[PDB]
Amino acid sequence: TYFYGGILEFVYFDKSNPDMCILVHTLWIHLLILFLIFTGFVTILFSFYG
Amino acid sequence: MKKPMAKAYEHPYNSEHHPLNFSAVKIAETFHDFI
């Protein structure tokens, strides 16, 4: 610290260590949601069955 | 009365739920099953 460090500063040390879980099924759910949105786009504007 | 034929030809790749050929009629049925 004396030779190669900076000033000694007081901070609050967070003991909780957050981390986003890199999962697989979260993208499956995300695709399912976009699939509902795209199907609704087709259902309203590209449905010619009536 | 003459005995008729047992059956005609049965296509091995055409079904009512998976029709081989495409048209808007089958898409209409799958659409109204969805909504």
XYZ file of C-alpha atoms in Angstrom, chain B:
35
model
C -75.469 -58.856 -55.330
C -71.846 -59.296 -56.366
C -69.251 -59.240 -53.618
C -67.599 -55.794 -53.820
C -63.896 -55.112 -53.401
C -62.484 -55.221 -49.888
C -60.739 -51.844 -50.004
C -59.142 -49.333 -52.329
C -55.573 -48.051 -52.142
C -54.468 -46.537 -48.836
C -51.803 -43.878 -49.212
C -48.981 -44.504 -46.698
C -48.168 -40.790 -46.264
C -51.574 -39.068 -46.113
C -53.593 -38.737 -42.919
C -56.441 -36.533 -41.788
C -54.387 -34.823 -39.079
C -51.224 -34.627 -41.228
C -52.485 -34.068 -44.778
C -49.790 -34.446 -47.399
C -50.836 -31.516 -49.579
C -51.275 -27.941 -48.395
C -54.203 -25.537 -48.545
C -55.705 -22.721 -46.509
C -58.520 -25.032 -45.383
C -56.323 -27.125 -43.105
C -54.633 -23.990 -41.793
C -58.106 -22.635 -41.051
C -58.973 -25.682 -38.957
C -55.726 -25.523 -36.983
C -56.286 -21.794 -36.500
C -59.773 -22.112 -35.022
C -58.607 -24.948 -32.803
C -56.036 -22.494 -31.426
C -58.236 -19.448 -30.823
